[PDB]
Design a protein around this nucleic acid. Sequence first.
RNA 1: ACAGCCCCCCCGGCAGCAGCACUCGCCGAAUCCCGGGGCCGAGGGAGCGAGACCCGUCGCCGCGCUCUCCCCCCUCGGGGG
RNA 2: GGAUGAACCGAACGCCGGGUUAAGGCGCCCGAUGCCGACGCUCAUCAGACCCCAGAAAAGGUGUUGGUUGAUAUAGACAGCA
RNA 3: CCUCGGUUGGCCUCGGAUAGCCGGUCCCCCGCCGGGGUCCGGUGCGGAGUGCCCUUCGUCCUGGGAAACGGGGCGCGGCCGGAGAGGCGGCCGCCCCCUCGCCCGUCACGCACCGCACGUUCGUGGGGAACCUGGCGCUAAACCAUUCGUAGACGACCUGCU
Lengths: 125, 201, 139, 109, 175
Amino acid sequence: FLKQLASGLLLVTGPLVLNRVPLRRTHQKFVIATSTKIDISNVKIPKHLTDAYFKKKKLRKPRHQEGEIFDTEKEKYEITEQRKIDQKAVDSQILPKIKAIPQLQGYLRSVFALTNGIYPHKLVF
Amino acid sequence: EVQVLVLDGRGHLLGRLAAIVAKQVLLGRKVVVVRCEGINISGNFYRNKLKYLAFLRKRMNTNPSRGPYHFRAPSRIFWRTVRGMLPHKTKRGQAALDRLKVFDGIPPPYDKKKRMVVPAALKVVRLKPTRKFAYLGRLAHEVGWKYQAVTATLEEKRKEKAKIHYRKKKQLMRLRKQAEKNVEKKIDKYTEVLKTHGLLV
Amino acid sequence: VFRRFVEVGRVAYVSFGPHAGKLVAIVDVIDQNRALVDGPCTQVRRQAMPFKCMQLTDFILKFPHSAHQKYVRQAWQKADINTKWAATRWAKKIEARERKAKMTDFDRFKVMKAKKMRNRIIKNEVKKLQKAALLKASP
Amino acid sequence: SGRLWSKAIFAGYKRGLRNQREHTALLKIEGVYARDETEFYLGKRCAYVYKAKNNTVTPGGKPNKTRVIWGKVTRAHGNSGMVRAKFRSNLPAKAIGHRIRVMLYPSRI
Amino acid sequence: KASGTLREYKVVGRCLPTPKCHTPPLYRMRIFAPNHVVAKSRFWYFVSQLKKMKKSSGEIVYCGQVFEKSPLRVKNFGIWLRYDSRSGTHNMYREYRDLTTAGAVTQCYRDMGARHRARAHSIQIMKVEEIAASKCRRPAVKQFHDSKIKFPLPHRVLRRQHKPRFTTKRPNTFF
RNA sequence: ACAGCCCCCCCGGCAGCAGCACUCGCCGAAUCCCGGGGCCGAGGGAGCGAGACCCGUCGCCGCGCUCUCCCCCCUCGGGGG
RNA sequence: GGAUGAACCGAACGCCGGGUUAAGGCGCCCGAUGCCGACGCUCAUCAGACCCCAGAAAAGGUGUUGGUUGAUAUAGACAGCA
RNA sequence: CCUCGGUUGGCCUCGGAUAGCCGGUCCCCCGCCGGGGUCCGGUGCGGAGUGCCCUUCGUCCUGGGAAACGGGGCGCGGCCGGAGAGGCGGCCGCCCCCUCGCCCGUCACGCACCGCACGUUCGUGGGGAACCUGGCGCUAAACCAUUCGUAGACGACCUGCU
Ligand SMILES: [Mg+2]
Ligand SMILES: [Mg+2]
Ligand SMILES: [Mg+2]
Ligand SMILES: [Mg+2]
Ligand SMILES: [Mg+2]
Ligand SMILES: [Mg+2]
Ligand SMILES: [Mg+2]
């Protein structure tokens, strides 16, 4: 977790080299806050990383009313070079702090699951 | 749960275990009760035998072939008790009843598996030590069950094989302890982690 | 047959109730079900306590029955019950249960990794010992 | 990659002895056998997932046989870890004794 | 009269002043009651039985709980009471061991209910007194007068019979 | 006495105080703050004012700032006293 | 709610959602004690188990548990043996 | 294709006692293993079901530890154990693979589908018709009709027929 945005959505990046999660918005209602933390103070989150930045973009539908020819083009979302630059800039200064504590990178590479013996109300996160 | 719950009937009180089993099968769980000849009933044997003889007396006067079916095997007795605690005349009750299997002794599907125990139905904790109790196997035998002797013989054979298996497991565990003693320089790095987080005192 | 007895000065561990997880000393006996009970160094003031929530330990203190907090506390502090209790296997099993319960998700992951490697090494050694023991051939 | 939901059993409807209120259901969450342990699951989304004959649209995927009746846990029931759940449509009676998933979605932790 | 954990109440009352006596005498009783409302009701019942008083003709000038002056000391209580059985009225002297007088009286009410099926409305507690250990008459109380009392807990029944409900290990009763 | 217990003292002192060492109450003009879950959203022209004109951000109630002037602390005019 | 029931107990009724109760209940049927409930009493070879209510008396018991009154006893009781 | 849906890791087992248990080890007896007597430990069960095992992001450079007498074969052939419902499990010989998979690190990459549900397993699920593709194998009864009369209201039954 990096910061809350203007709409209350969290901005997160489980670094893309670790678990393929880019700089991406998420909802605090649909996340579990664990107890493990890293000191991401004095790192520079870029100012343009805003809700308008992360808002989805669409192509359809100008100059087209009735569909006889499929408008399924552009459906392949494209990762912008600006997005790649921002991801590199954030990860280059988040990763050294992750490597500062042992096997946190392995923890971040792993995914969470419910074993048949464990129960979420008895789990300390 | 999603797997079968196997309960050892030895040392368990009839109605207590049957109530637990009825609730379990109504909650959509597969339950298998084994060694139903080891089930205990509180109260002395003569009184319990009198109860079952009264049950035998209850029959349809016009046509006993239609009347109450008095089952003599201990497994079938326990099954009828569970059916008494189930709503067996509805589809839900019949499905719950189908989710229950009962056996005398421990048959080959289940003699190689661990068996659970229900403490809330155990005689040792549910019954005062001075009180008298009856064995379901003896009651069934003296009310008409025909396979007490052969079940005892097969149970003795199963116990011999289980003793052999347990000796093998003890030998394996002794060897594992010896292995843990042998390798500890390359193990203490993880033993400290386990001890720190509470596993492996 | 019996080795632990309810008596004056016997130290008991509280299993449940408002004072669960604490050590107390039995000061007196009331009517077969209760005891006058005092933890002067484990922060349990003198009160009645049922025997059902008591689990007797192996420590016995030497003070007369219905003595005051002063004498019970001196008996507790001399031959310190706290350090001896912490040294016993019972208390460290309790502590292990507590620290297993308070383990977080990252700690669970690290324990999983350590236990994985430890079990693999132990299993390899067990296989080696089995193969070493299998070479028995003597008429 | 993982189960990510708690197992529960549709025990039955809220009811007296001879009256049944089908608008709310009783759920038995596995491992929760006391009333004080039910506070975690209050407000959590719950789903009755089943299969049918005709294909239905799947959000973010191809149509398949899977159907869901969504709901959520409202309050604790009894003293033994029962909970009450309200679903968008009343649960079918054939689901009694079957699986309900408690999805952890409205997380408060 | 129901029960709970009873409390001792000192209840002091008197008649209302009349142009026959301007200062009627004050009367005090010890009432063991769940609360002060029941305490006042029982006070009126008893003074109506003893003196010629009524709640309407008199007043209660004080009703205060009597705290036990040594709740940290085990002591022996003798209780003189009378009760109505199904076929008569009997006087009883009972003995209990407790820290508090009110607790001893509660023990007495429970024990009378258990042994004689005597409901609390049938029971009249007429005297409660702390007694010396040498003046006790009931062997069940006297057997605890041992400076070296010692006994084990022989057959400890499992009480956590549903946590877990299903298990592999059978419980142990020896500790 | 080579432990202790009870009562009165010639009188106590300190801390705490219905105790965050869970022994035993009744309460709140002697009572306030914060948080979580559940169910619900019925109504639809509220403008004494400009003589309304973008869809009345309106009434009652509780507040803040300006039409006075000094300073203080952070930002680089903005924010906080 | 009392299994069941014109009259009992609770409560009187438009169609619904939420909360809480009454009388009554909370092993399973069957919602709810899956409380580490409290103290005792009781073993029945016809046990007992809740208003109306759906079965019992006089009289007994060296079964057991309390209680009342009286009596004997180191000037040696009681019971056994002589 | 048609239809039926459930499920979302496993535990492969002493006997049991409860006013007692469990484990380990030296001497005696009986086939090199078990049973006794010592002795040593544990016992609010830690050789613990309040437990154990497995643990799913995947790869690429890349070092250190574990191993290297190691794992994989819907690969062949052989053997053994299991009968209470064995529907299962284990061990050898030959061959073909990789030195990878386990832990801690280096190094970057993968649709990063732009906050969102039915995701994730058992599973190559069960059942039914049908097409193609190969190999190895089989060529039968029942009933009616007839007959019998040990049978019989009729059915049914006992029988005979190169
Ligand atoms: Mg206070
Ligand atoms: Mg509206
Ligand atoms: Mg009715
Ligand atoms: Mg009736
Ligand atoms: Mg309502
Ligand atoms: Mg009922
Ligand atoms: Mg229920």
